[PDB]
Design a binder for this molecule. Structure first.
Ligand SMILES: Cc1cc2nc3c(=O)[nH]c(=O)nc-3n(C[C@H](O)[C@H](O)[C@H](O)COP(=O)(O)OP(=O)(O)OC[C@H]3O[C@@H](n4cnc5c(N)ncnc54)[C@H](O)[C@@H]3O)c2cc1C
Ligand SMILES: CCCCCCCC/C=C\CCCCCCCC(=O)O[C@H](COC(=O)CCCCCCCCCCCCCCC)COP(=O)([O-])OCC[N+](C)(C)C
Ligand code: HEM
Ligand code: HEM
Ligand SMILES: *[C@@H]1O[C@H](CO)[C@@H](O[C@@H]2O[C@H](CO)[C@@H](O[C@@H]3O[C@H](CO)[C@@H](O)[C@H](O)[C@@H]3O)[C@H](O)[C@H]2NC(C)=O)[C@H](O)[C@H]1NC(C)=O
Ligand SMILES: *[C@@H]1O[C@H](CO)[C@@H](O)[C@H](O)[C@H]1NC(C)=O
Ligand SMILES: *[C@@H]1O[C@H](CO)[C@@H](O)[C@H](O)[C@H]1NC(C)=O
Lengths: 134, 529
């Protein structure tokens, strides 16, 4: 049937990009409590790294993002933590929670929580992240 | 590209003009002088992208009107036709710009909100806070839209979850990013059901966008106020405003909403188009024959009054019983000249299994269906070239069934109007299991020709990637192009491809190396369906 992991991946990477944008705009503009924006910069960079390599489908031939081979090797190194979708979902939600203290990053938080939800959905289905071997 | 370059350049120039123009409509004039000091330069950087979003949002809905654009194209120079076939590439471009301008707008309104709250809680320069004092009392209009004294960052979160522009901004930002993140090529192609359903948050996006600017919180000094309040004299007398004759307290109003004036027409057009599509769903299509081919493919041969097709075209079929809401697209696999029109449907999933089960193919009445219309780009040109080299890979053979079946009819009907004389067909497939119906067509066209003593017409090879008659491995396109080049000298040949992109580059490269520069020389025009 449908593979929610693909849409969860695409949503999570953009949530990370928006978190980076909101954190950078909080840091540069010296928004009061800019340290939450600084957290958003580091959390968004980490989300983009972790969510850049798309996984391999159960059926068919998948597309790979540009320069994903390097990222896939790193994500493979962490064993089950990247693989499990329960771990990925709880990681995304926990990283989203402190970013919700600033308006510039509230949009990131919501988007990351929407993604962690789709990861949760994929986790219930039995889906996991198997790497795309070359 | 005439039309493509023209439309893209005009659209980009209009965006640049609107941005520059509305940047200076909100930066130069003295009407917005005091706002530009509470908000700084982040006023115009919020309001020029808003004008660009006004224009872009009207544009996004127009090249996706499926039934209205087809009605226009039925009456609307093949060089031209293919440029206007890039309506879904223009939709994507407009949507990406909607994202870009929205991002600029959003970031600017984040500075605005910060600075507005900050001044309200005595955490800014003296002048902005003094300006924030307006609107507390009677007979004075605020300039600062933050009115509760809640310190940042909680003041910013309050304004978003209480201001109408903030609540609608958050809602349609979520409903814009979700559309975008659920519209990557992988979602659009591997999981179409997620793309289509989530793409309907557009109704929410436009509904939030229409009521987005109702509050008029971004306010400028009114014209009558400017007439009595000479700004250059009154700026430094803020501490005594209203108590000196020269400087009455300035009055600020908000601009009336403008976006509804833009998006009213396209939403109406899209609603009329959806009603036209519903009307096509109500129209009669009698399913004369259902043939169950091997490996779960059902050929549905059906008649609908007034259906005219062209080779290569596809239709959308809805079966109300399987899904009231969805139309699934299928290529017309029958000749244009036949009374009936056919589609060959391979059972791969939920709707298709539902049609199969409903039809009764499963068991030892037939469901009501509704065909949307010949859509797609025709491949009528196949007939014009004297020789052709159709190459179909995998599930891409399907378009060629209509074409191949049609050539026979034109040969029988006239035998002179068919300029075509030779067809070389290459089927590159992993296996022939699900497309066995096609092998039978290819055998027949040849058999009919052989009976009619023109055994020369149809030469075909099936090449099995997994590893006349079947062969193993892909064709050596280096060899094939030269061989046909030897047999047919001084002639133009069209290599029509309906297969993967890698194959498409391979053939185009092969075409050009093979095609002779000289006017006498064989040319190998390449068209990719
Ligand atoms: C121009 C065009 C011509 C086509 N011609 C044919 C044809 O001749 N024969 C044929 O069997 N199929 C054809 N298809 C696709 C066919 O409509 C799908 O196989 C069918 O919709 C599957 O529905 P399902 O219930 O099995 O969906 P699922 O099994 O859930 O989907 C399986 C695959 O079908 C795609 N798909 C699902 N719904 C749609 C939709 N509404 N539009 C497009 N793709 C969809 C998905 O991207 C997915 O990869 C064509 C599609 C297009 C765009
Ligand atoms: C791609 C396209 C992106 C397009 C996006 C953004 C394009 C620009 C959006 C609007 C920015 C407003 C600028 C503004 O107010 O300028 C000045 C303030 O500016 C500042 O003080 C801070 C400047 C920081 C700039 C950060 C840019 C965003 C980067 C984000 C990350 C980028 C992406 C990262 C992705 C990984 C105005 O100053 P002023 O006129 O003096 O007014 C003072 C007024 N008071 C204070 C007195 C009231
Ligand atoms: C940003 C990336 C976007 C992409 C890639 C995209 C892509 C597409 C595609 C391919 C279609 C054709 C649907 C089909 O084949 O059946 C489509 C239809 C449509 N899109 Fe978009 N789109 C995007 C954004 C938007 C936006 C921002 C809006 C408006 C808010 C929008 C509104 C529509 C509408 C109304 C349709 C027609 C739906 C129908 O007729 O069934 N899209 N889009
Ligand atoms: C995400 C946070 C957003 C905030 C805080 C925000 C805030 C605002 C505000 C304060 C206004 C002026 C309202 C008024 O004068 O009454 C406005 C206008 C506007 N915004 Fe937004 N906005 C956001 C997102 C968006 C998005 C995603 C779009 C996408 C189309 C958009 C399009 C517009 C438009 C077109 C206007 C002009 C309204 C008009 O002239 O009638 N905004 N926005
Ligand atoms: C709040 O603002 C309103 C309107 O700006 C003020 O009401 C207006 O006050 C002027 C000054 O007295 C009134 O003009 C007078 O009109 C009478 C006839 O009604 C005329 O005999 C006088 O010579 C003078 O021209 C004006 O009518 C009045 N407007 C209304 C609608 O009553 C109001 O005073 C302000 N409130 C406070 C507390 O200052
Ligand atoms: C605002 O803060 C400044 C800085 O100390 C102070 O001088 C001024 O009196 C304050 N105004 C109010 C209304 O609290
Ligand atoms: C504002 O005051 C200046 C200074 O006297 C004067 O030159 C200008 O004409 C005045 N403008 C208006 C609109 O009254």
């Amino acid at each position: 049937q449908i593979e929610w992991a693909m849409w969860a991946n695409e949503q999570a990477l953009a949530s990370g990009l928006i978190l980076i944008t909101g954190g950078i705009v909080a840091t540069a503009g010296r928004f009061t409590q800019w340290y939450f924006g600084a957290y958003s910069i580091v959390a968004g960079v980490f989300v983009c790294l972790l969510e850049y390599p798309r996984g391999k489908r159960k059926k068919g031939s998948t597309m790979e993002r540009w320069g994903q081979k390097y990222m896939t090797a790193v994500v493979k190194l962490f064993g089950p933590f990247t693989r499990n979708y329960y771990v990925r979902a709880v990681l995304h939600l926990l990283l989203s929670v402190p970013a919700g203290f600033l308006l510039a990053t509230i949009l990131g938080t919501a988007c990351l929580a929407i993604a962690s939800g789709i990861y949760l959905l994929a986790a219930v289905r039995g889906e996991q992240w198997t790497p795309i071997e070359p | 590209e005439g039309l493509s370059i023209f439309v893209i350049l005009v659209w980009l120039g209009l965006n640049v003009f609107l941005f520059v123009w509305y940047y200076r409509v909100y930066d130069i004039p003295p009407k917005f002088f005091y706002t530009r000091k509470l908000l700084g330069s982040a006023l115009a950087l919020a309001r020029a992208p808003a004008a660009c979003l006004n224009f872009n949002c009207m544009l996004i809905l127009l090249p996706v009107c499926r039934n209205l654009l087809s009605f226009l194209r039925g009456s609307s120079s093949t060089r031209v036709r293919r440029q206007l076939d890039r309506n879904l590439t223009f939709h994507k471009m407009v949507a990406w710009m909607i994202a870009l301008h929205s991002a600029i707008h959003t970031i600017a309104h984040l500075f605005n909100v910060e600075w507005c709250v900050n001044a309200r809680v005595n955490n800014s320069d003296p002048y902005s806070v003094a300006l924030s004092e307006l609107g507390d009392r009677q007979n004075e209009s605020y300039l600062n839209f933050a009115r509760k004294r809640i310190k940042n960052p909680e003041g910013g979160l309050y304004l978003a979850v209480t201001l109408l522009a903030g609540i609608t901004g958050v809602v349609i930002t979520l409903c814009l990013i979700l559309i975008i993140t659920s519209s990557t090529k992988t979602i659009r192609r591997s999981y179409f059901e997620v793309f289509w359903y989530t793409h309907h948050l557009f109704v929410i996006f436009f509904i939030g966008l229409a009521i987005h600017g109702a509050e008029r919180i971004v306010r400028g000094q009114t014209a009558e106020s400017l007439a009595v309040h000479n700004i250059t004299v009154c700026e430094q007398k803020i501490s005594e405003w209203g108590k000196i004759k020269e400087c009455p307290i300035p009055q600020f109003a908000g601009n009336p909403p403008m976006t509804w004036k833009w998006i009213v027409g396209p939403m109406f057009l899209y609603l009329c188009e959806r009603l036209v599509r519903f009307w096509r769903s109500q129209q009669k299509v009698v399913i004369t024959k259902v043939v169950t081919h091997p490996f779960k493919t059902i050929e549905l041969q059906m008649k609908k009054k007034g259906f005219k097709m062209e080779v290569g075209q596809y239709i959308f079929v809805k079966c109300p019983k399987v899904s009231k809401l969805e139309w699934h697209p299928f290529t017309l696999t029958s000749a244009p000249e036949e009374d009936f029109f056919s589609i060959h449907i391979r059972i791969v999933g939920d709707w298709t299994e539902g049609l199969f089960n409903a039809c009764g193919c499963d068991k030892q009445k037939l469901p009501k269906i509704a065909v949307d219309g010949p859509f797609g780009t025709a491949s009528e040109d196949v007939f014009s070239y004297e020789v052709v080299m159709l190459v179909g890979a995998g599930i891409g053979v399907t378009p060629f069934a209509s074409i191949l079946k049609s050539v026979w009819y034109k040969y029988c009907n006239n035998a002179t109007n068919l300029k075509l004389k030779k067809i070389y067909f290459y089927w590159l497939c992993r296996d022939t299991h699900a497309f066995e119906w096609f092998a039978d067509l290819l055998q027949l066209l040849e058999s009919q020709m052989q009976e009619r003593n023109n055994a020369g017409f149809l030469s075909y090879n099936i090449y099995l990637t997994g590893w006349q008659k079947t062969l193993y491995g892909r064709p050596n396109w280096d060899n094939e192009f030269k061989t046909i080049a030897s047999q047919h000298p001084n002639t133009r040949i069209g290599v029509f491809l309906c297969g993967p992109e890698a194959l498409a580059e391979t053939l185009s490269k092969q075409s050009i190396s093979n095609s002779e520069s000289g006017p006498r020389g064989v040319h190998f025009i390449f068209n990719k369906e």
